[PDB]
Ligand binder design. Structure first.
Ligand SMILES: [Mg+2]
Lengths: 255, 247
């Protein structure tokens, strides 16, 4: 209520995930190393709400999931819980596991789970078909939202997909493995749409499934949630979110 | 919420809520997608509830002249209700006064007209002709978005159009011909499914959500938000839309 963001210095959790965030590894310092749709959102928020900021990446370079053995979190989620950051500024997918530990902002993009495949010959119509064959290998990225959704799905055959697939390290590793062929990568619609635009030999496996949002992550009891929510709703209403997606997402297709 | 009683603001808006005006008592007068959501929330969270309609039967908007709200929004602000349980569209005017729950459905503004082969391509073209009349429902989200749009020609559309009473009046007027009705995609999709001679005008525009409305500082927001996200994740929201929408 009384507390606002004017003069505050926010620590923002993020990682590279194109086209939401691009991180330059040389030739830059501080905030200048970052660009993309989410960066443009943060810049505008900072101008309108009067805060300064920096970005902090988790050492493990994970988005974050809950380990059922240890009952601990990792990734950006863990950094937020540990007060290393004040908000997670990325395409942070909404899931119930995360919601048990943190809050979300007002959301800015509907998304679904999408499976894609590279391979000549017989192909697949739905991901559970993977369990009854050995032509294709498959995987999800460890400690990221799709893995969490598949592992918590009430049809435990989706847990089988995770347990019996390859645990991919990160998006680059996953895309490199997909491009190697005879592989199904199960991830998120907007991320795959952008990043695989010029992969003319990569195709869909069925339709998208599951419904969720991208939002920012906030700690429970954050004094800044109401302001962030209001300003994100305004960005959506003014058309700013759509304008940024057009600016940053890939167009055409050599294919 | 265990043992608590919630007073829920709502109105009929098919297929989200159907309100029987006879032949029922209490909560059993209500049915629809939103009612199914509330019943499940009640079961899982352990509260009792009742539905309270605003006397003015409006969704609610801010009157610029008086700086007062009406409709369900006003009832919530007056502490007549604890939560608004309906397809409550998200807009910045409402956000200045109330909170929203986690949302459950993307929606846009859509314009429709009776009669095949309309010459209109985009709603702003209405301002430069006099064959068609047009309108929005008063004290409802589309009116608010058009009145607050950056391009004041949208305010012209509202001000120079017909102010419709409610969804029934709007659809009646639409079905009368030579009339462009501007409202919300999912509402129009459901209610006009059997109108084979009603067609879109231009593309959908504006991006918003349906959510529930909550008073600022509600002690119930966290739990409602968590349970609505779980409904979405479990596929319940999609199952309910399939159940209730046509078709
Ligand atoms: Mg949405």
């Amino acid at each position: 209520g009384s507390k606002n963001l004017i003069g505050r210095h926010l620590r923002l959790g993020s990682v590279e995930e194109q086209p939401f965030m691009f991180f330059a590894t040389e030739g830059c310092e501080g905030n200048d190393c970052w660009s993309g749709m989410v960066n443009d959102m943060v810049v505008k928020l900072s101008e309108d709400l009067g805060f300064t900021y920096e970005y902090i990446q988790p050492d493990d370079r994970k988005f974050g999931a809950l380990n059922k053995t240890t009952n601990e979190w990792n990734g950006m989620i863990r950094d937020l819980l540990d007060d290393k950051t004040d908000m997670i500024a990325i395409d942070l997918s909404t899931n119930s596991a995360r919601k048990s530990a943190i809050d979300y902002s007002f959301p800015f993009m509907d998304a679904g789970i999408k499976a894609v495949v590279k391979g000549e010959g017989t192909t697949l119509n739905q991901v559970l078909e993977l369990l009854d064959q050995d032509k294709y290998k498959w995987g999800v990225i460890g400690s990221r939202h799709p893995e969490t959704l598949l592992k918590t799905h009430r049809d435990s055959r989706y847990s089988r997909l995770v347990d019996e697939g390859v645990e991919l390290k990160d998006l680059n590793h996953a895309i490199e493995t997909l491009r190697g062929g005879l592989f199904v990568f199960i991830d998120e619609g907007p991320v795959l749409a952008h990043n695989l635009i010029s992969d003319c030999d990569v195709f869909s496996v069925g339709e998208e499934f599951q419904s969720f949002e991208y939002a920012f992550g906030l700690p429970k009891d954050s004094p800044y949630k109401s302001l962030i929510d209001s300003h994100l709703l305004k960005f959506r209403e003014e058309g700013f979110i759509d304008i940024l997606w057009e600016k940053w997402s890939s167009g055409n297709s050599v294919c």
